[PDB]
Design a protein around this ligand. Structure first.
Ligand SMILES: Nc1ncnc2c1ncn2[C@@H]1O[C@H](COP(=O)(O)OP(=O)(O)O)[C@@H](O)[C@H]1O
Lengths: 348, 115, 104
């Protein structure tokens, strides 16, 4: 009758002492530690002169420091570290699905090559100025669709250590003006904070160039966003620890400025499965479905080319569909054979 | 005289070792190529095989590397007296470029720094 | 091409500096510099790939030469001899264009 109210009621006395608190506005000190008074810049606010905490650590109050300020009296309070957006809904989380290079089929050259160019400067960086050159920064995963692009970086997502910044390039842009450039400088400054880091911007035709002349509102807002993204891929350093890679369809609509070796050096052409990669995809998506033994993969692969990985899991998906409305045990050979010949009906 | 022993056996080796186990055999048959290329005591036909064993090595899950212990466990075997050494000459343009061969041009540099 | 036709007018700029996408008498100097900060073993040639002068920046000279070194990292080599030069160049030595025979 007393310990219960003491614990789970007197623990909830905290609401009054925390209710007494007042909250503090934030701002950025435009430095000028005018000794006793500094000039700070509020977020949506004016620049103005503020007094100080009187026993604050003034010597590390660097120009461009997030600081908290009082509301009524307005004297500067306890400082802050440099913020992060919901880039937490960017870095801290993506699509790494314990997918490995086992699910990646038939492109071992491209994934060994991407793996070496992207994390092998992070394994042995000393061998490169040994040869006498800095490592490259970017790769552009241009290809026909399907084909393992977005995923490929899923396998890279679940096999690396650094914060794999996986972002869709069209959740970048917002309706407010100068906002997307805030987001992209926040992204790359966040990459400066945690190193080494990998920044995955797929589908990038949203920020993809071939800059225009005349739409003047919905495009020049992004053709100045691509200026900030471009002048921080380039920068005045080389970013020296972080490596971004971008995956898209339509490389023939991208900006020349963003393609010039430097922003994206080793442009990788991921390609449709030839025959060997076709049977690779067919075995991998034919794996966890129950099977036959001597199920003729070779006539399926021989049958009609020009598919994608997505189209071959569409084959096993349609054949499992055939058994699931046809009520059989697994498939038959005529269910793969009836599966490909309906996928082959699906042209453009 | 002793050519087709090492070369005939090696022609038998290039399909039973190269295709495809080779791994411990990289420290076995190549070292047997050089020690059976040394037990007949030739020096013309010695430095005519190591450079003709490069340029094409093996298949997947084997290596082009690991002939450096095939080299370095062979160099300090003879201390032939006057001067003849192609051991110092041929092993400075055939072992071009590896991170494993630091002790080849380093300790063979020291061999040049003493002889 | 779309900068503004009031940003110059002899007062706001008064100048204009063209950057050339360089050619023969310059391209040689770019290769001489970028190769002069690498490890070479002289099986390379200089003016052979100064030849075929076809539409290069300096950035893709740094890409084919940087790519030459990185393609030499395959065999864990501290130099580059013959193929990584030619090799990387051809691979991304302009990944080609689209000619067009008859006319020309
Ligand atoms: N080599 C491959 N192996 C397995 N799946 C593949 C392969 N290539 C493409 N895919 C399919 O593509 C999907 C991933 O999307 P993706 O191909 O990257 O399209 P986008 O490039 O538009 O993201 C996967 O769900 C997968 O089924």
């Amino acid at each position: 009758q007393l310990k219960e109210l003491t614990k789970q009621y007197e623990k909830s006395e905290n609401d009054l002492k925390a209710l007494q608190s007042v909250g503090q506005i934030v701002g950025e000190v435009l430095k000028q530690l005018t000794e006793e008074k500094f000039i700070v810049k509020a977020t949506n606010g004016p620049r103005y002169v503020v007094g100080c905490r009187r026993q604050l650590d003034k010597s590390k109050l660097k120009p461009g420091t997030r600081v908290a300020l009082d509301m009524t009296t307005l004297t500067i309070m306890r400082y802050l570290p440099r913020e992060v957006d919901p880039l937490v809904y960017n870095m801290s989380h993506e699509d790494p699905g314990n997918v490995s290079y086992s699910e990646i089929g038939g492109l071992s050259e491209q994934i060994r090559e991407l793996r070496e160019v992207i994390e092998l400067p992070l394994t042995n960086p000393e061998l490169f100025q040994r040869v006498g050159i800095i490592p490259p920064k970017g790769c552009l995963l241009y290809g026909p669709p399907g084909t393992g692009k977005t995923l490929l970086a899923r396998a890279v997502a679940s096999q690396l250590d650094c914060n794999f910044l996986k972002v869709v390039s069209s959740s970048i842009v917002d309706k407010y003006i100068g906002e997307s450039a805030r987001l992209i400088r926040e992204m790359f400054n966040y990459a400066r904070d945690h190193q080494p880091c990998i920044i995955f911007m797929d589908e990038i035709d949203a920020i993809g160039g071939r800059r225009f002349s005349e739409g003047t509102s919905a495009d020049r807002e992004i053709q100045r966003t691509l200026m900030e993204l471009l002048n921080q891929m380039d920068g005045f350093d080389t970013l020296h620890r972080v490596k971004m890679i971008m995956a898209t369809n339509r490389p023939d609509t991208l900006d020349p400025a963003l393609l010039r070796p430097g922003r994206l050096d080793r442009k990788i052409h991921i390609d449709l499965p030839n025959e060997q990669a076709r049977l690779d995809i067919l075995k991998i998506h034919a794996g966890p479905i129950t099977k036959h033994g001597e199920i003729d993969y070779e006539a399926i692969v021989k049958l009609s080319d020009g598919f994608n990985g997505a189209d071959l899991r569409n084959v096993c998906t349609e054949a499992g569909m055939f058994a699931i409305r046809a009520d059989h045990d697994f498939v038959v050979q005529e269910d793969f054979m009836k599966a490909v010949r309906k996928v082959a009906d699906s042209k453009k | 005289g002793r050519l087709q022993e090492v070369i005939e056996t090696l022609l038998s080796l290039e399909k039973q070792t190269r295709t495809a186990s080779d791994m411990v055999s990289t420290s076995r048959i190549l070292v047997a190529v050089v020690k059976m290329c040394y037990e007949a005591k030739e020096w013309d036909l010695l430095n005519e095989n190591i450079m003709l064993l490069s340029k094409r090595r093996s298949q997947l899950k084997q290596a082009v590397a690991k002939m450096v212990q095939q080299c370095c466990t062979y160099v300090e075997e003879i201390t032939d007296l006057p001067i003849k050494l192609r051991l110092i000459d041929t092993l400075r343009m055939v072992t071009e470029g590896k991170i494993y061969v630091e002790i080849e041009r380093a300790r063979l540099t020291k061999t040049l720094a003493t002889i | 091409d779309t900068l503004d036709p009031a940003l110059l007018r002899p007062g706001r700029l008064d100048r204009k500096i063209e950057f050339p996408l360089p050619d023969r008498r310059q391209k040689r100097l770019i290769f001489s510099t970028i190769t002069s900060k690498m490890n070479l073993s002289e099986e390379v040639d200089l003016e052979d790939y100064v030849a075929r002068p076809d539409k290069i920046s300096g950035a893709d000279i740094n890409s084919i030469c940087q790519e030459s070194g990185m393609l030499a990292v395959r065999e864990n080599r501290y130099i580059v001899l013959a193929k990584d030069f030619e090799k990387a160049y051809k691979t991304v030595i302009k990944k080609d264009e689209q000619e067009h025979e008859f006319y020309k």
